[PDB]
Amino acid sequence: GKIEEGKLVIWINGDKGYNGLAEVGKKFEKDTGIKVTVEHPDKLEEKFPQVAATGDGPDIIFWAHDRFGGYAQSGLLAEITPDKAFQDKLYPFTWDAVRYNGKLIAYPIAVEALSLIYNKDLLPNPPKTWEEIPALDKELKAKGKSALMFNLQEPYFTWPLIAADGGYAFKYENGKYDIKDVGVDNAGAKAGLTFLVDLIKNKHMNADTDYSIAEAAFNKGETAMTINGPWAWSNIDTSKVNYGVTVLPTFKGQPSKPFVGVLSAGINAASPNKELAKEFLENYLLTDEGLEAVNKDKPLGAVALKSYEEELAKDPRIAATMENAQKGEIMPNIPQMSAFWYAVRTAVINAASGRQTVDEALKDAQTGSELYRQSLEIISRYLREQATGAADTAPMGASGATSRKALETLRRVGDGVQRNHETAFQGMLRKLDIKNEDDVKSLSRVMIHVFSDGVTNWGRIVTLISFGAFVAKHLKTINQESCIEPLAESITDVLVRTKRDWLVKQRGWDGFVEFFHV
Ligand SMILES: Cc1c(C(=O)O)n2c3ccc(Cl)c(c13)-c1c(nn(C)c1C)CSCc1cc(n(C)n1)CSc1cc(c3ccccc3c1)OCCC2
Ligand SMILES: OC[C@H]1O[C@H](O[C@H]2[C@H](O)[C@@H](O)[C@@H](O)O[C@@H]2CO)[C@H](O)[C@@H](O)[C@@H]1O
């Protein structure tokens, strides 16, 4: 339950240079007498938010930057406040990757992008296009080899192809994300994923291939190509395969667009060792010697530290990494990234296995990715118009008909629940004694308990939201209207976290509208 004072516990993924990181920890111990323990738990990016929410977990968590906005939003990360001298030692765009609501919430370490890795003794020149891979596989099959194996279990590896002809996560224009505008089930995404599925149908790839299977095949000289990041180069070096690292193939004449990650280190908000952690990260790890120790274990990519990157940049494999990165897109760090990845992971796995068609898989992924924002739209608008008596005139935006009709439905059914359950609602409002924002943020734990116990149905979702409206009316009448949007956010988080899979199975809010159709 409590993080131990006077030591450092660090989590890093098991594909990274954790032995090199431990060597940095031993240098830290030699100076300070403070022991550093490096661990690489399975699913650490899922475990961290669970354990840290209880005040437990590591002092320092390493992951790509995309998960950190979610952690920061949940209050799990300490704000990072390096001095100018330190900040100037790292590239500005790396600090940008770890900025969330105006605050730095991790230290950037290195820039990662996937590349095409190829065996020059099988394939002296890499394919420039995805479309030529089937014919190459046919040539290679006659030699008792295959063209390509890569991890089909993690959507990170398949995204570059999905993105190539126009798939996107959240639209980015005019220096801004439009979180309502999700690009998972458009014609471009379908074209990419169909190409992948056709590779599998035509026995060029196997839907069961995972990281270890692809890595072993490439490193044993059994397959001519793989798709992987810099961390994989150590094991390829050890294997003695004559390998190149190059630009990903094009699809429909367009570059493959990898999602670019910045390996980052956050400090747990519950750590009593924040000063020790800052010292470790700034004055041991983010040094030429610290990064070299990690990079010698498993390569980092293009490091954030300018002095060391100037050495590393002369490596053609790093040049290739950066070429692919420039053709791709820096991942968002918005809290909705976790859901996007979960939705797309399932879509790829189901399309690849034949459990769903591409169209079915991508429709579900779209709905899953849109769920938080659409739910918040509906719930916020209902609570606010209930509180004030006046509706919001702003356009609903994307999937607007569904939002509008869900709101219209919820007006009917939710107004009814408020009337019929006035007595329970008034009683409970009095018991909970909500006076301010602090009281609203305290509701989540109890709300999750109540709502997640028992059966799942649309009626209970209506009760959740309708009591929210009942509370919002109270908040407005005591001059606490500023608490309504935090309330709506809390209710939305409870709903979507606890009922994600059920919601997607209903066609989200279209299910709700149909369920209560008069
Ligand atoms: C039965 C019921 C449900 C449900 O079926 O899941 N929900 C209610 C919401 C409110 C009420 Cl009054 C009732 C319910 C209810 C009760 N009896 N009857 C006859 C009714 C209709 C009281 S026993 C259940 C209960 C409620 C709380 N506790 C400690 N136990 C307050 S902690 C909280 C909970 C919220 C909240 C939802 C929005 C905002 C704040 C919330 C703060 O939503 C919980 C999920 C929705
Ligand atoms: O597959 C979804 C997954 O993609 C990214 O994770 C990468 C990670 O960034 C790399 O450093 C390397 O470890 O491979 C992972 C893919 O298995 C996202 O960072 C992650 O949040 C997301 O779930």
XYZ file of C-alpha atoms and ligand atoms in Angstrom:
587
model
C 0.000 0.000 0.000
C 2.743 2.606 0.697
C 5.769 3.214 -1.499
C 8.897 2.647 0.611
C 10.977 5.775 1.439
C 14.756 5.686 0.837
C 15.029 3.457 -2.213
C 14.016 3.620 -5.896
C 11.788 1.104 -7.645
C 11.706 1.504 -11.453
C 9.397 -0.196 -14.017
C 10.441 -0.516 -17.642
C 9.147 -2.779 -20.406
C 10.846 -6.065 -20.959
C 11.887 -5.226 -24.531
C 14.072 -2.344 -23.315
C 17.579 -2.219 -21.890
C 16.692 -2.989 -18.270
C 20.101 -4.497 -17.465
C 21.761 -1.343 -18.703
C 19.292 0.672 -16.645
C 20.225 -1.372 -13.579
C 23.896 -0.526 -14.248
C 22.929 3.169 -14.009
C 21.140 2.288 -10.770
C 24.350 0.717 -9.403
C 26.263 3.960 -10.212
C 23.545 5.876 -8.329
C 23.888 3.506 -5.322
C 27.674 3.930 -5.333
C 27.304 7.736 -4.966
C 24.354 7.862 -2.563
C 23.956 4.510 -0.767
C 20.381 4.349 -2.166
C 19.460 0.981 -3.782
C 17.713 1.104 -7.194
C 15.541 -1.893 -8.165
C 14.587 -2.226 -11.824
C 11.632 -4.467 -12.680
C 9.954 -5.363 -16.011
C 6.471 -6.678 -15.076
C 4.158 -7.991 -17.710
C 1.470 -5.523 -18.773
C 3.115 -2.774 -16.706
C 1.272 -0.044 -18.638
C -2.013 -1.594 -17.438
C -0.727 -2.408 -13.904
C 0.704 1.057 -13.204
C -2.619 2.936 -13.222
C -4.255 0.255 -11.012
C -1.491 0.212 -8.357
C -0.681 3.924 -8.462
C -4.359 4.807 -7.844
C -3.955 3.094 -4.416
C -0.762 4.987 -3.609
C 1.421 2.041 -4.481
C 3.616 1.086 -7.489
C 7.097 2.068 -8.636
C 8.787 5.387 -7.951
C 9.540 5.750 -11.715
C 7.601 4.332 -14.677
C 9.050 4.129 -18.215
C 6.727 3.892 -21.220
C 6.188 5.664 -24.498
C 4.652 9.077 -23.920
C 1.209 8.164 -25.269
C 0.005 6.581 -21.998
C 1.196 9.422 -19.753
C -1.655 11.911 -20.347
C -4.076 9.310 -18.957
C -1.870 8.793 -15.918
C -1.480 12.571 -15.335
C -5.269 13.145 -15.733
C -5.780 10.484 -13.039
C -3.378 12.329 -10.698
C -0.764 9.556 -10.807
C 2.269 11.629 -11.946
C 4.367 14.266 -10.262
C 4.972 17.479 -12.202
C 8.544 17.650 -13.637
C 10.347 20.995 -13.090
C 13.857 20.845 -14.555
C 15.902 24.027 -14.621
C 16.693 25.769 -17.918
C 20.215 24.348 -17.976
C 18.795 20.844 -17.926
C 15.883 21.516 -20.286
C 18.226 22.955 -22.911
C 20.208 19.688 -22.970
C 17.205 17.856 -24.635
C 15.463 18.502 -27.943
C 12.362 20.738 -27.578
C 10.092 18.358 -29.498
C 10.867 15.646 -26.929
C 9.669 17.927 -24.066
C 6.571 18.609 -26.171
C 5.733 14.859 -26.123
C 5.649 14.928 -22.280
C 3.625 18.109 -21.832
C 0.050 17.636 -20.656
C -2.349 20.572 -19.841
C 0.660 22.941 -19.815
C 2.783 20.930 -17.352
C 5.724 18.581 -17.936
C 4.780 15.175 -16.531
C 7.774 13.021 -17.506
C 11.363 13.134 -18.673
C 11.824 12.277 -22.346
C 14.441 9.605 -23.073
C 14.392 8.609 -26.791
C 12.422 8.710 -30.039
C 11.122 5.374 -31.348
C 9.696 4.517 -34.713
C 9.299 1.221 -36.496
C 11.357 0.406 -39.578
C 11.504 -2.376 -42.093
C 14.348 -4.720 -41.123
C 15.562 -7.073 -43.884
C 18.048 -9.897 -44.365
C 20.430 -8.901 -47.170
C 21.414 -12.572 -47.803
C 17.807 -13.360 -48.685
C 16.667 -10.061 -50.111
C 19.518 -7.880 -51.314
C 17.157 -4.983 -51.938
C 14.104 -4.355 -49.795
C 10.681 -3.990 -51.391
C 9.609 -0.414 -51.879
C 5.894 -1.368 -51.849
C 3.597 -3.545 -49.764
C 1.978 -4.693 -53.017
C 5.090 -6.514 -54.238
C 5.372 -8.595 -51.047
C 3.083 -11.424 -52.121
C 5.207 -12.103 -55.258
C 8.418 -11.946 -53.124
C 6.918 -14.412 -50.658
C 6.186 -16.786 -53.581
C 9.847 -16.524 -54.663
C 11.050 -17.089 -51.148
C 8.682 -20.009 -50.423
C 10.462 -21.871 -53.227
C 13.728 -21.466 -51.212
C 12.148 -22.787 -48.117
C 11.831 -19.247 -46.645
C 9.163 -16.550 -46.347
C 9.053 -12.842 -47.033
C 7.739 -11.213 -43.850
C 6.925 -11.892 -40.192
C 6.007 -9.331 -37.561
C 3.938 -9.072 -34.441
C 0.227 -9.252 -35.345
C -0.930 -9.151 -31.690
C -0.129 -5.493 -31.017
C -1.704 -2.850 -33.202
C 1.404 -0.671 -32.992
C 2.966 -2.889 -35.698
C -0.017 -2.911 -38.079
C -0.961 0.767 -37.669
C 1.599 2.018 -40.210
C -0.222 0.144 -42.974
C -3.693 1.091 -41.668
C -2.651 4.762 -41.620
C -1.007 4.773 -45.045
C -4.092 5.278 -47.269
C -5.908 7.550 -44.768
C -6.673 5.821 -41.472
C -6.122 8.016 -38.455
C -6.705 8.057 -34.735
C -7.734 11.578 -33.873
C -7.685 14.250 -36.596
C -4.917 16.901 -36.195
C -5.356 20.274 -37.930
C -4.303 23.888 -37.341
C -2.008 22.866 -34.448
C -4.958 21.097 -32.649
C -6.523 17.622 -32.244
C -10.210 17.229 -32.957
C -10.931 14.429 -30.445
C -14.424 13.964 -31.912
C -12.945 13.155 -35.349
C -11.783 9.528 -35.318
C -10.389 7.924 -38.554
C -10.517 4.158 -37.730
C -13.348 3.045 -40.052
C -12.823 5.112 -43.186
C -11.977 3.798 -46.690
C -8.205 4.225 -46.109
C -8.153 2.201 -42.880
C -10.275 -0.469 -44.502
C -7.875 -0.649 -47.514
C -4.858 -1.145 -45.212
C -6.428 -3.693 -42.962
C -7.899 -5.567 -45.949
C -4.392 -5.800 -47.404
C -3.131 -7.319 -44.159
C -6.008 -9.742 -43.987
C -5.429 -10.765 -47.629
C -1.758 -11.504 -46.763
C -3.035 -13.906 -44.100
C -5.784 -15.416 -46.358
C -3.142 -16.033 -49.034
C -0.792 -17.717 -46.497
C 1.903 -15.018 -46.673
C 1.472 -14.447 -42.919
C -0.105 -16.261 -39.999
C -2.643 -14.511 -37.713
C -1.025 -16.175 -34.662
C 2.395 -14.584 -35.157
C 3.490 -12.590 -32.124
C 6.627 -10.687 -31.075
C 8.693 -13.724 -30.027
C 7.715 -15.837 -33.028
C 8.615 -13.106 -35.529
C 11.835 -12.233 -33.750
C 12.992 -15.865 -33.627
C 12.158 -16.418 -37.320
C 14.040 -13.332 -38.469
C 17.039 -13.925 -36.233
C 17.313 -17.571 -37.338
C 17.294 -16.536 -41.061
C 13.939 -18.142 -41.753
C 12.063 -14.994 -42.932
C 13.532 -12.198 -45.051
C 11.883 -9.209 -43.299
C 10.389 -8.052 -40.056
C 8.981 -4.769 -38.687
C 10.434 -3.627 -35.391
C 12.025 -0.814 -33.455
C 15.544 0.019 -32.341
C 15.356 -2.115 -29.205
C 15.327 -5.205 -31.467
C 18.752 -4.524 -33.043
C 20.780 -6.106 -30.185
C 19.347 -9.539 -30.651
C 19.766 -9.253 -34.440
C 23.447 -8.298 -33.909
C 23.926 -11.350 -31.661
C 22.335 -13.593 -34.396
C 24.878 -12.442 -37.040
C 22.182 -11.960 -39.679
C 23.362 -9.598 -42.377
C 20.601 -7.036 -41.860
C 19.535 -3.618 -43.080
C 17.131 -1.105 -41.518
C 15.157 0.899 -44.021
C 12.046 2.844 -44.934
C 8.754 0.974 -44.573
C 7.135 -0.054 -47.817
C 4.529 2.253 -49.416
C 0.865 1.271 -49.757
C -1.157 2.643 -52.684
C 1.866 4.811 -53.381
C 1.683 6.501 -49.974
C 4.239 6.112 -47.104
C 3.546 3.782 -44.244
C 2.946 6.080 -41.280
C 4.218 4.677 -37.991
C 2.932 6.117 -34.729
C 6.108 7.655 -33.214
C 6.722 7.187 -29.458
C 8.992 9.048 -27.077
C 10.218 6.662 -24.385
C 9.616 8.679 -21.193
C 10.123 8.401 -17.451
C 7.425 9.576 -15.039
C 7.598 9.938 -11.299
C 4.732 8.430 -9.294
C 2.730 11.171 -7.507
C 2.613 8.882 -4.439
C 6.398 8.451 -4.260
C 8.127 9.786 -1.107
C 11.402 9.639 -3.168
C 10.695 12.424 -5.738
C 13.993 14.168 -5.111
C 15.959 10.934 -5.435
C 14.042 10.143 -8.646
C 14.775 13.576 -10.178
C 18.449 13.214 -9.281
C 18.602 9.763 -10.811
C 16.879 10.788 -14.056
C 18.612 14.154 -14.631
C 22.101 13.404 -13.300
C 22.591 9.692 -13.916
C 20.336 8.514 -16.743
C 20.066 11.581 -18.981
C 23.821 11.833 -19.382
C 26.062 10.578 -22.154
C 27.284 7.725 -19.903
C 23.809 6.796 -18.588
C 22.213 6.617 -22.020
C 25.178 4.688 -23.394
C 24.764 2.036 -20.684
C 21.108 1.572 -21.644
C 21.703 1.855 -25.390
C 24.498 -0.835 -25.302
C 21.995 -3.216 -23.744
C 19.116 -2.470 -26.185
C 19.205 0.477 -28.533
C 17.029 3.430 -27.562
C 16.520 5.056 -30.965
C 17.219 8.754 -31.418
C 17.979 9.904 -27.854
C 16.558 13.096 -26.429
C 19.925 14.257 -25.073
C 21.527 16.430 -27.770
C 25.143 15.593 -26.928
C 24.666 11.832 -27.232
C 22.291 12.028 -30.163
C 25.011 13.785 -32.123
C 27.082 10.526 -31.929
C 24.110 8.185 -32.545
C 22.790 10.172 -35.587
C 25.731 8.992 -37.813
C 24.328 5.406 -37.623
C 22.363 4.541 -40.798
C 19.893 2.533 -38.673
C 19.077 5.674 -36.720
C 18.809 7.624 -39.948
C 16.264 5.071 -41.147
C 14.383 5.316 -37.841
C 14.105 9.063 -38.268
C 13.061 8.790 -41.908
C 10.201 6.534 -40.877
C 9.386 8.816 -37.934
C 9.155 11.879 -40.269
C 6.733 9.957 -42.466
C 4.666 9.025 -39.418
C 3.036 11.028 -36.636
C 3.902 11.641 -32.983
C 1.343 9.851 -30.890
C -1.128 11.942 -28.983
C -0.909 11.695 -25.157
C -4.629 12.343 -24.604
C -6.365 10.089 -22.006
C -8.376 8.497 -24.848
C -5.251 6.786 -26.303
C -5.605 3.725 -24.078
C -9.131 3.130 -25.396
C -8.126 3.739 -28.991
C -5.359 1.102 -28.660
C -7.643 -1.382 -27.040
C -10.275 -0.961 -29.719
C -7.793 -1.243 -32.586
C -5.962 -4.224 -30.972
C -9.227 -6.155 -30.934
C -10.130 -5.072 -34.452
C -6.834 -6.286 -35.910
C -6.875 -9.560 -34.036
C -10.521 -10.265 -34.993
C -10.055 -9.312 -38.662
C -6.877 -11.409 -38.859
C -8.490 -14.479 -37.260
C -11.712 -14.181 -39.307
C -13.871 -13.670 -36.171
C -15.073 -10.427 -37.835
C -14.909 -9.023 -41.296
C -12.732 -5.931 -41.801
C -15.883 -3.790 -42.013
C -17.327 -5.259 -38.805
C -14.004 -4.987 -36.950
C -13.341 -1.420 -37.861
C -16.973 -0.342 -37.142
C -16.537 -1.680 -33.579
C -13.172 -0.034 -33.201
C -14.672 3.326 -34.344
C -17.447 3.020 -31.758
C -14.979 2.060 -29.020
C -12.641 4.922 -29.828
C -15.523 7.494 -29.967
C -17.206 6.227 -26.799
C -15.726 8.475 -24.114
C -16.173 11.745 -26.023
C -19.631 10.957 -27.285
C -20.766 9.834 -23.803
C -19.372 13.014 -22.273
C -21.092 15.134 -24.846
C -24.490 13.618 -24.081
C -24.051 13.506 -20.300
C -22.544 17.010 -19.984
C -25.298 18.506 -22.132
C -28.046 16.768 -20.158
C -26.693 17.783 -16.769
C -26.114 21.362 -17.834
C -29.525 21.904 -19.444
C -31.215 20.246 -16.494
C -29.413 22.557 -14.094
C -30.034 25.805 -15.988
C -33.289 25.060 -17.851
C -31.713 26.081 -21.160
C -30.223 23.865 -23.873
C -26.808 24.124 -25.468
C -27.016 25.581 -28.933
C -23.540 24.433 -30.115
C -23.367 21.775 -32.887
C -22.950 18.197 -31.577
C -20.179 17.638 -34.126
C -19.180 14.173 -35.275
C -21.780 11.410 -34.961
C -24.088 14.331 -34.166
C -27.378 12.684 -35.050
C -26.676 9.905 -32.524
C -25.698 12.453 -29.837
C -28.749 14.502 -30.519
C -31.138 11.556 -30.504
C -29.461 10.112 -27.339
C -30.002 13.441 -25.661
C -33.612 13.582 -26.811
C -34.118 10.023 -25.450
C -32.424 10.788 -22.191
C -34.721 13.863 -21.774
C -37.735 11.554 -21.897
C -36.472 8.631 -19.850
C -34.206 10.541 -17.462
C -36.850 13.119 -16.645
C -39.138 10.197 -15.834
C -36.625 8.521 -13.545
C -36.088 11.864 -11.690
C -39.832 12.167 -11.109
C -40.447 8.565 -10.151
C -37.394 8.274 -7.928
C -37.590 11.738 -6.440
C -37.852 10.309 -3.002
C -34.685 8.061 -3.277
C -32.823 10.820 -5.066
C -33.652 13.516 -2.535
C -32.765 11.164 0.317
C -29.410 10.190 -1.133
C -28.544 13.755 -2.199
C -28.988 14.769 1.502
C -26.798 11.844 2.741
C -23.949 12.452 0.301
C -23.834 16.179 1.296
C -22.060 17.451 -1.835
C -20.812 21.085 -1.242
C -17.997 21.661 -3.777
C -15.599 20.249 -6.259
C -13.664 18.299 -3.617
C -16.870 16.471 -2.686
C -17.585 15.744 -6.359
C -14.109 14.215 -6.925
C -14.678 11.978 -3.862
C -17.761 10.351 -5.451
C -15.931 8.195 -8.054
C -14.879 5.316 -5.707
C -18.387 4.780 -4.292
C -20.086 5.409 -7.680
C -17.957 2.648 -9.337
C -18.817 0.232 -6.489
C -22.549 0.758 -6.768
C -22.802 0.877 -10.534
C -20.429 -2.076 -11.289
C -22.256 -4.471 -8.873
C -25.398 -6.184 -10.330
C -26.902 -6.550 -13.751
C -26.045 -4.420 -16.779
C -28.777 -2.663 -18.656
C -29.749 0.642 -20.156
C -32.125 1.401 -17.205
C -29.316 1.484 -14.737
C -27.280 3.734 -17.022
C -30.295 6.077 -17.038
C -30.384 6.032 -13.211
C -26.656 6.917 -13.104
C -27.072 9.829 -15.447
C -30.426 10.987 -14.020
C -29.047 11.210 -10.479
C -26.224 13.148 -12.016
C -28.762 15.616 -13.369
C -30.471 15.725 -9.962
C -27.087 16.586 -8.335
C -26.316 19.128 -11.045
C -29.577 20.980 -10.380
C -28.577 21.133 -6.696
C -25.070 22.380 -7.588
C -26.495 25.229 -9.718
C -28.945 26.308 -6.990
C -26.087 26.604 -4.392
C -23.801 28.640 -6.692
C -21.562 25.669 -7.505
C -22.296 25.535 -11.269
C -18.515 25.155 -11.853
C -18.808 21.653 -10.375
C -21.166 20.390 -13.099
C -18.594 19.693 -15.781
C -16.295 17.778 -13.324
C -19.402 15.803 -12.263
C -20.210 14.967 -15.862
C -16.630 13.895 -16.480
C -16.689 11.627 -13.427
C -19.967 9.957 -14.413
C -18.706 9.482 -17.985
C -15.504 7.866 -16.734
C -17.427 5.461 -14.496
C -19.757 4.541 -17.314
C -17.241 3.922 -20.084
C -14.607 2.193 -17.927
C -17.050 -0.204 -16.287
C -19.222 -0.919 -19.353
C -16.924 -0.564 -22.377
C -17.429 -4.023 -23.929
C -21.209 -4.030 -23.331
C -21.530 -0.576 -24.748
C -19.681 -1.544 -27.946
C -21.895 -4.655 -28.238
C -25.001 -2.266 -28.252
C -23.670 -0.072 -31.042
C -23.039 2.426 -28.225
C -25.538 5.227 -28.010
C -27.397 4.042 -31.140
C -28.361 0.995 -29.009
C -29.732 3.303 -26.322
C -31.820 5.268 -28.784
C -33.262 2.063 -30.274
C -33.899 0.493 -26.852
C -36.110 3.429 -25.743
C -37.734 4.136 -29.148
C -41.468 4.996 -28.837
C -30.319 2.050 -7.416
C -29.456 3.203 -7.915
C -28.539 3.050 -8.953
C -28.270 1.848 -9.725
O -29.127 1.087 -10.139
O -26.981 1.548 -10.008
N -27.883 4.272 -9.100
C -28.344 5.196 -8.212
C -28.024 6.493 -7.989
C -28.646 7.203 -7.015
C -29.689 6.589 -6.251
Cl -30.409 7.521 -4.984
C -30.038 5.255 -6.443
C -29.381 4.546 -7.451
C -31.119 4.655 -5.628
C -31.103 4.249 -4.290
N -32.281 3.757 -3.981
N -33.050 3.800 -5.100
C -34.446 3.318 -5.094
C -32.387 4.357 -6.117
C -32.992 4.534 -7.502
C -29.961 4.376 -3.335
S -29.098 2.743 -3.149
C -27.770 2.901 -4.439
C -26.765 3.957 -4.066
C -26.513 5.254 -4.568
C -25.488 5.812 -3.850
N -25.191 4.889 -2.897
C -24.178 4.955 -1.839
N -25.958 3.764 -3.062
C -24.801 7.169 -3.993
S -22.943 7.238 -4.483
C -23.275 7.803 -6.091
C -23.829 6.855 -6.939
C -24.255 7.221 -8.240
C -24.094 8.570 -8.624
C -24.512 8.963 -9.942
C -24.387 10.262 -10.341
C -23.855 11.222 -9.476
C -23.426 10.882 -8.196
C -23.517 9.554 -7.755
C -23.111 9.149 -6.423
O -24.787 6.351 -9.093
C -24.911 4.981 -8.742
C -25.475 4.210 -9.865
C -26.915 4.620 -10.148
O 0.215 -1.943 -29.699
C -0.312 -0.796 -28.982
C 0.761 -0.182 -28.098
O 1.646 0.545 -28.968
C 2.678 1.254 -28.294
O 3.504 0.381 -27.528
C 4.738 0.002 -28.129
C 5.836 0.802 -27.423
O 5.652 2.205 -27.676
C 7.245 0.412 -27.885
O 8.207 1.066 -27.046
C 7.413 -1.100 -27.877
O 7.485 -1.503 -26.563
O 6.318 -1.771 -28.380
C 4.988 -1.481 -27.902
C 4.042 -2.305 -28.761
O 3.944 -3.638 -28.297
C 2.055 2.277 -27.325
O 3.108 3.008 -26.668
C 1.167 1.523 -26.344
O 0.606 2.490 -25.395
C 0.086 0.730 -27.079
O -0.691 -0.011 -26.143
